[PDB]
Amino acid sequence: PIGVWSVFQGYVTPARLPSIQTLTRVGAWGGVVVVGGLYMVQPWDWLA
Amino acid sequence: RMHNKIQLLSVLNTHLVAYPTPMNLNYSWNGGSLAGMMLASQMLTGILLAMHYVGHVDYAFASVQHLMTDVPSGMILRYAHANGASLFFIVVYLHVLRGMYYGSGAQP
Amino acid sequence: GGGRVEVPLSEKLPAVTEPPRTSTPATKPIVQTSSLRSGVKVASINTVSPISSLVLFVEGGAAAETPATAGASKVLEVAAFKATANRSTFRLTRELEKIGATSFARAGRDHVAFGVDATRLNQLEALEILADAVVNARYTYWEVRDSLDAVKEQLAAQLRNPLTAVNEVLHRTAFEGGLGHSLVVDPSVVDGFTNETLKEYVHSIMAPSRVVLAASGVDHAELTALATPLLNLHGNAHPAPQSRYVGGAMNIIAPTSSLTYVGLAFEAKGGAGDIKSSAAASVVKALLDEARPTMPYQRKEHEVFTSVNPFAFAYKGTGLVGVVASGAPGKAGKVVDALTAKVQSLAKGVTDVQLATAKNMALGELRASVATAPGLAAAVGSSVLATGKFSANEVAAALSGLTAADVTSYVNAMIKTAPTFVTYGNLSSLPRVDSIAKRFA
Amino acid sequence: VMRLSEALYQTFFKRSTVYIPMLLVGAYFSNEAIDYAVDKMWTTRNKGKLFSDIIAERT
Amino acid sequence: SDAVEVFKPETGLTPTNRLSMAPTPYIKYDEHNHKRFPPGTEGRPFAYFV
Amino acid sequence: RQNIPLREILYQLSPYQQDVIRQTFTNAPKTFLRFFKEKGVGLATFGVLFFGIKGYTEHEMHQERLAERY
Amino acid sequence: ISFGSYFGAKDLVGALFLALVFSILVFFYPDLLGHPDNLIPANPYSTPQHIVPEW
Amino acid sequence: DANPFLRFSNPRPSPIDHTPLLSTLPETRITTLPNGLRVATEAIPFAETTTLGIWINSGSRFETDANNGVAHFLEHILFKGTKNRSVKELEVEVENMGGQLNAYTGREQTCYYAKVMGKDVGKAVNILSDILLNSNLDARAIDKERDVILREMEEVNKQTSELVFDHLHATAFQYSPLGRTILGPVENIKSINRDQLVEYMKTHYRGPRMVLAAAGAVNHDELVKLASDAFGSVPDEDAATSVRSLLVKEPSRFTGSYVHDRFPDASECCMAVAFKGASWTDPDSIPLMVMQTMLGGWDKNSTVGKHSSSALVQTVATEGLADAFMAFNTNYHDTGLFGVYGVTDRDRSEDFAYAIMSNLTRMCFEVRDADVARAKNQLKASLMFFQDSTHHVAESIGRELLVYGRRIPKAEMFARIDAVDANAIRAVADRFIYDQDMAVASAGDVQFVPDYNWFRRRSYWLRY
Amino acid sequence: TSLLKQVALPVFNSLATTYRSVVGAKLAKYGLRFDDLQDPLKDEDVAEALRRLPPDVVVARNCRLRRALDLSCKHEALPKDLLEKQTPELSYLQDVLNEVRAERRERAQLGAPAPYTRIYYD
Amino acid sequence: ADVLLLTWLGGNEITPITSFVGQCCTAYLFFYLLVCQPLVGYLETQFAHG
Ligand code: HEC
Ligand code: HEC
Numbered sequence A: 001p002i003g004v005w006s007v008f009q010g011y012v013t014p015a016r017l018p019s020i021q022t023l024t025r026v027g028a029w030g031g032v033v034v035v036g037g038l039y040m041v042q043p044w045d046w047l048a
Numbered sequence B: 001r002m003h004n005k006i007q008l009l010s011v012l013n014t015h016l017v018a019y020p021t022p023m024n025l026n027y028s029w030n031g032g033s034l035a036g037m038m039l040a041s042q043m044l045t046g047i048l049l050a051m052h053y054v055g056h057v058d059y060a061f062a063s064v065q066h067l068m069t070d071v072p073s074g075m076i077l078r079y080a081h082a083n084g085a086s087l088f089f090i091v092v093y094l095h096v097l098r099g100m101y102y103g104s105g106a107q108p
Numbered sequence C: 001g002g003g004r005v006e007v008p009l010s011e012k013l014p015a016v017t018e019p020p021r022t023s024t025p026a027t028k029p030i031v032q033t034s035s036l037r038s039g040v041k042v043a044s045i046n047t048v049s050p051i052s053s054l055v056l057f058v059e060g061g062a063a064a065e066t067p068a069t070a071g072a073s074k075v076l077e078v079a080a081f082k083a084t085a086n087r088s089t090f091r092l093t094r095e096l097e098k099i100g101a102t103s104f105a106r107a108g109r110d111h112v113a114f115g116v117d118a119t120r121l122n123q124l125e126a127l128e129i130l131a132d133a134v135v136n137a138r139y140t141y142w143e144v145r146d147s148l149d150a151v152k153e154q155l156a157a158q159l160r161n162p163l164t165a166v167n168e169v170l171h172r173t174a175f176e177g178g179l180g181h182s183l184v185v186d187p188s189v190v191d192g193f194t195n196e197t198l199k200e201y202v203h204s205i206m207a208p209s210r211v212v213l214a215a216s217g218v219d220h221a222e223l224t225a226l227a228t229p230l231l232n233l234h235g236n237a238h239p240a241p242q243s244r245y246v247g248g249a250m251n252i253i254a255p256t257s258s259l260t261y262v263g264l265a266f267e268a269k270g271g272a273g274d275i276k277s278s279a280a281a282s283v284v285k286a287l288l289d290e291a292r293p294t295m296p297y298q299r300k301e302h303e304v305f306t307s308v309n310p311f312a313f314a315y316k317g318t319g320l321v322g323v324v325a326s327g328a329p330g331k332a333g334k335v336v337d338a339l340t341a342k343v344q345s346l347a348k349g350v351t352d353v354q355l356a357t358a359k360n361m362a363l364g365e366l367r368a369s370v371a372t373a374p375g376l377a378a379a380v381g382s383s384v385l386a387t388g389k390f391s392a393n394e395v396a397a398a399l400s401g402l403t404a405a406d407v408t409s410y411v412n413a414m415i416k417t418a419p420t421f422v423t424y425g426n427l428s429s430l431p432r433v434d435s436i437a438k439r440f441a
Numbered sequence D: 001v002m003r004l005s006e007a008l009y010q011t012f013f014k015r016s017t018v019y020i021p022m023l024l025v026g027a028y029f030s031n032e033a034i035d036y037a038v039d040k041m042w043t044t045r046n047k048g049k050l051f052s053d054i055i056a057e058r059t
Numbered sequence E: 001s002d003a004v005e006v007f008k009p010e011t012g013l014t015p016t017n018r019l020s021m022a023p024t025p026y027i028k029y030d031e032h033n034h035k036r037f038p039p040g041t042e043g044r045p046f047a048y049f050v
Numbered sequence F: 001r002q003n004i005p006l007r008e009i010l011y012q013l014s015p016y017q018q019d020v021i022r023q024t025f026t027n028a029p030k031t032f033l034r035f036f037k038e039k040g041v042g043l044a045t046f047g048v049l050f051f052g053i054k055g056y057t058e059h060e061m062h063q064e065r066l067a068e069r070y
Numbered sequence G: 001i002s003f004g005s006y007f008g009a010k011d012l013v014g015a016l017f018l019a020l021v022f023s024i025l026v027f028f029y030p031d032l033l034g035h036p037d038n039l040i041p042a043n044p045y046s047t048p049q050h051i052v053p054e055w
Numbered sequence H: 001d002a003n004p005f006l007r008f009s010n011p012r013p014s015p016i017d018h019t020p021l022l023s024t025l026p027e028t029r030i031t032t033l034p035n036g037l038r039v040a041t042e043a044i045p046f047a048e049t050t051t052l053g054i055w056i057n058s059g060s061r062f063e064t065d066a067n068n069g070v071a072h073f074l075e076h077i078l079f080k081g082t083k084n085r086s087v088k089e090l091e092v093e094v095e096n097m098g099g100q101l102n103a104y105t106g107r108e109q110t111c112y113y114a115k116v117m118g119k120d121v122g123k124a125v126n127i128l129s130d131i132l133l134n135s136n137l138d139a140r141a142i143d144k145e146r147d148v149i150l151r152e153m154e155e156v157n158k159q160t161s162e163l164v165f166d167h168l169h170a171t172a173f174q175y176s177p178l179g180r181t182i183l184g185p186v187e188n189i190k191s192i193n194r195d196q197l198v199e200y201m202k203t204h205y206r207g208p209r210m211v212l213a214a215a216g217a218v219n220h221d222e223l224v225k226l227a228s229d230a231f232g233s234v235p236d237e238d239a240a241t242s243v244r245s246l247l248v249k250e251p252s253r254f255t256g257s258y259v260h261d262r263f264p265d266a267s268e269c270c271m272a273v274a275f276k277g278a279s280w281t282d283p284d285s286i287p288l289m290v291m292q293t294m295l296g297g298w299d300k301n302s303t304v305g306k307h308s309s310s311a312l313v314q315t316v317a318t319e320g321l322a323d324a325f326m327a328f329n330t331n332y333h334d335t336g337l338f339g340v341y342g343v344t345d346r347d348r349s350e351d352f353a354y355a356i357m358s359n360l361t362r363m364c365f366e367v368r369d370a371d372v373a374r375a376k377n378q379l380k381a382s383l384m385f386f387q388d389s390t391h392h393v394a395e396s397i398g399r400e401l402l403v404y405g406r407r408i409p410k411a412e413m414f415a416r417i418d419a420v421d422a423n424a425i426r427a428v429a430d431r432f433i434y435d436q437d438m439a440v441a442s443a444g445d446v447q448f449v450p451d452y453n454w455f456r457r458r459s460y461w462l463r464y
Numbered sequence I: 001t002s003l004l005k006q007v008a009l010p011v012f013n014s015l016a017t018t019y020r021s022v023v024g025a026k027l028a029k030y031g032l033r034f035d036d037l038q039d040p041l042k043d044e045d046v047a048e049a050l051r052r053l054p055p056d057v058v059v060a061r062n063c064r065l066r067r068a069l070d071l072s073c074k075h076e077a078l079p080k081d082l083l084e085k086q087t088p089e090l091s092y093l094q095d096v097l098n099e100v101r102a103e104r105r106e107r108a109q110l111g112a113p114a115p116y117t118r119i120y121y122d
Numbered sequence J: 001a002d003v004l005l006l007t008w009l010g011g012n013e014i015t016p017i018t019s020f021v022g023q024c025c026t027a028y029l030f031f032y033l034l035v036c037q038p039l040v041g042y043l044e045t046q047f048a049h050g
């Protein structure tokens, strides 16, 4: 009863969902893994 | 109690001797212990096998043949290690199908 | 960025005095009372305060309890303002906390009071929340079961003070009937309590002629017009066990009481119904005030006493005016002798300065009780429930128009009546009971 | 006594998602500087003995 | 709540009881290993840069 | 371990005051029939689906080998 | 109920069934579940007709 | 759905406009005497009682190390007899006007006030001026109070919360005047005398530092005349010895630090964590008031704590982390303190500490608008409740003239509260809380309280 | 699709009754009720709703659970005289659990979480 | 039955009928794992305790 049971019962409202700021702060981790992979591999001037 | 004075005996007692289990479990709850027995059997047979196997091309086939015909009890060890993988997968597959049937992965 | 104008500086042109000053009313507002068609009496008094207080007074308390429903008023103090037929507990709590309002449940010895205090802009919300939490309360099983623990520590903490225990035993000894029942019961009395017991007690105490709605700072016509569909009540008046004063004496055994407490009381004839007798009893209570803490860190030393605490309770038809004094365990007979000497010297006459001082003390207490809106609403509700009217102006006139001869006559008539005597503590020194109640005869 | 600047704190230090890419570019440049210093010292000390010195000598 | 009924201290003018009733603002730390900065030193620490 | 409120009386007999393997020979056909009655529908569903789809696939494979046959 | 008394022999029964099947597979049909092509030495230039894994 | 029982009310938090409440609120009149003393009244139209007193911009901060404790000892001595009235004469005259005298002595503020009826305004003015100006300060009464204070010091007779807060002020304001206790050390009490009391009153009780504030039933012109007759003889203040010059000369300093007061057989575990807050004149003090309302407070005699609007109250009430707690917002002339104080035991102290730190840091990142609207409504309602009691009206008049320099109108206060939104709360929490040093104080059974590095680590999040 | 949904409501009732009849016939061989299938370890709403019951109901539920588990261990069923008295559709938990779920729905629309957590055994 | 059919099909040759049957078996495997288990289970809960 964690997962689809939470949304079938009506426990996932517009509230209790993450805010736009929370999703942006989590979404800012996308650049970190890209920069880390480019740091690890170093394909310099490989962008087309 | 003697098991209350050594911490190894306390853990072994708690998790293998006095562990409370439902009394109405049928024979489809024996998949896990069989899977553990097959894992231990595969480990033992393989560690014994690796003392006669050579992991190089142009020696691997001949080392398996020398294991089969010249090592004492070597044919038993090889055939046991080969068919034990099949029995290990049979047991683990039946275990997974039990969990699928009963909904064993649910909370908690 | 937010506002950066510092508070020593005035706020800028976005700070307007757009509401004009409303003119003051010509006279002091008067109490206006009426009755609903269901029979519930509604009384209200207008104020200039920005706080509106709404209180609901129901006859009951310890006087309406039975041996089966023992300690139900104390449980009702905790279990009130929870889940109703229309709202859950969560919804009522959030609706009170949204407008910044506060709620109380308070159980007396002859009444239970429920109240909501809010600002003047949320008086309809406060009235609706109070009426829904009183009339349509559910008293579920699990909520009462979980509240019983907190009830037990609140009673255990309230019985730590010896004055509460002395007051309980004094009310037991002074009266037979409803007023002799125990309000602050032992914690183990409510050990077998359930929600059925509370529902039975509530069904006994609730009736349209035993419920008064009192409001402070609310227009009366609006309040009656909007409370008529909300306080339409039905039910039967459970019989009230009328109390009578008989007097007597008792004792209490306390194993680790570092002091020893002695209570002496008499009956105030007429109860809360007589204005003059209640005023004279309040004057006597102020005359017995030996060590009143009017200044910080002042050390008034008595030869024998450690604390003096008088009182004057005015119930319906009868009252109880008296004094409780502490003292050392080895000097309890001296405490009794000094208390008898004080009451006898009061009976020997009051001398002008003492009479004026006690009248000013009584007037100050009376006016400071109704200074705030919740205190004024509680005073209006209690006076209307006990009598049918609010007469604070008449009480002040009775306090001011009291002569020393009237007070001396009052104390003389008091000491002829049989008294009530209660002791407390690890009692290892006591004069015999026959000679205890002889000094006023 | 010595204290990190507030304006430099609010830019490169307050969030980890800004701190980590700055950390990686600083790591890259630090590795480049250490490589340069070690290689320059080694080539200066052993001049005339390496294979590239013989090859450039034969030009 | 009172400290005599909750903490239940010993009676007397012991060194711990003196600081319990009136703590001093002139706290002395040990400075054999680290010397303190002047009190009230503001700003984000230089150790992040290091 | 948890506290379970429960009102019962339990009786147990010694293992050495009982027979060990003598009611197996009596309950054996009833156990067989009860097992097949309880799990009859699922075993039949599995067998019908598996063998019918396998037979259809094998028949179509033979037909496709015959269609290219000279 | 306790694991160590009641579910030790119950696991031992199933382990003995598994040992029976295992002994049959080892001693009587050792190459039943395999593939005969794995008894040919590996040739990177010649591929077998059917390339299938274990079951 | 009930028709009459379900209108008008709903649990959805919406902003409330408190503008129509401003039409009938009374006005404050201020008159400055040539002495420099301000006389400020607020007449409630049908009041029967009056609170009036003298508020002084002085206290334990403006003492020295040699006379620390003189201002607290002054409220032990001042009511023990004057040069015109004895102890019994003062007692009889106060009893006949039906009121009580009272006194408070803070770190920066002192008040002596009377709660009387409206007919006894002039008598209360005369009595208050008599204790303030013509006191005996007898050496026998000083010796009679020194021994009582020394006994209660030897017994460690103190509230637990006051003990924790005194430790907190001592460790957060090291080597500044605000780190001293109001009570003072044992040695200053053991060597106190009449000369130090005279010198303190002569130095600090002057015209520009004193407000005579009266609320309830009082006329402004008559109080002006009575104050000019009575309090007209107070000395004026030198420009070189003003309150601002003393604030500049000895400023406040905040140091991030930790103290615990361990006892061997205690039961409770009281603890407070505070950050460096705002001064009284900082415009960020209104958002700190809103944030303190957002954190709230709770004690275990309530049973509706699980339905609270505040998430910290919800967490502590649901998991049972503390017996009681409260969030505080202390403001001084040039600094402040913001944080949470609570009472727990040794097995729940770390989880309570984690709940405090996690709820403080959460306000920098995620703040929803419903909580801010709820807290604004609750704070405005709390401000309206103080208007109901004339004692709080007089206290606010005295405090606002001492520390703001002026009487802030109610319309300006409502407008300044209504200008707070969620972005302002996030900005103020980012300024004061995030990655900053804090002060930690505990007392009692504190062996399981985490050390300073645990508290310092949890002032920031590594996941954003 | 609302017109077809209105036709699907007696169809829903028919399938619900048929399912309940078949499962209750399977349930009554062990003496169990429908409400006995709900597990506090599986569902925290059931764990909270079971905490709101008077203790005699919990004792009766625990007795029924132990009886069914004993029957399952024995590979037996109830005797016919006992099997004729079984009422597997008698509700003791439904109103309590419904009110718990309604409370959790009402709290979630305002952002509040549930005041109870999962059950942890460690 | 679907999983055992997929096990049987893996040992055969690539044929248009075996390709079609394997595609249908894979589609039903995903259908059971992702559609039957949540939706039919929710319907069962609504039937039993609804
Ligand atoms: C994909 C699922 C899965 C795999 C693969 C699996 N397990 Fe299990 N196992 C489970 C689940 C789920 C349970 C709990 C079953 C229950 O209690 O209903 C379980 C239970 C067990 C038990 C307790 C006894 C029993 O059989 O119920 C043991 C022992 C066990 N597993 C061991 C193993 C071993 C050893 C392996 C592999 C070498 C293994 N398992 C592989 C899911 C799995
Ligand atoms: C899950 C299955 C599995 C496990 C576990 C396992 N093996 Fe085996 N191993 C195999 C299979 C299958 C083969 C192929 C046997 C064959 O066909 O001859 C193999 C082959 C080998 C061989 C080559 C010799 C030969 O006869 O093929 C060695 C050596 C070996 N394994 C060692 C080990 C060792 C050592 C371990 C553990 C420590 C181990 N194995 C565990 C599956 C397994």
Ligand SMILES: COC1=C(OC)C(=O)C(C/C=C(\C)CC/C=C(\C)CC/C=C(\C)CC/C=C(/C)CCC=C(C)C)=C(C)C1=O
Pocket (backbone or CB within 6 Å): B021, B025, B029, B030, B032, B033, B034, B035, B036, B037, B040, G003, G007, G011
């Ligand atoms: C639902 O109830 C349960 C069951 O169902 C009745 C179970 O079955 C089990 C688990 C069963 C266990 C642990 C026994 C099965 C054996 C296993 C997993 C391992 C097999 C090992 C063997 C045979 C011997 C290995 C020997 C050696 C020397 C290796 C160790 C190495 C060193 C000491 C260096 C559990 C916990 C259970 O709760």
Ligand SMILES: [Zn+2]
Pocket (backbone or CB within 6 Å): H072, H073, H182, H183, H184
């Ligand atoms: Zn002091």
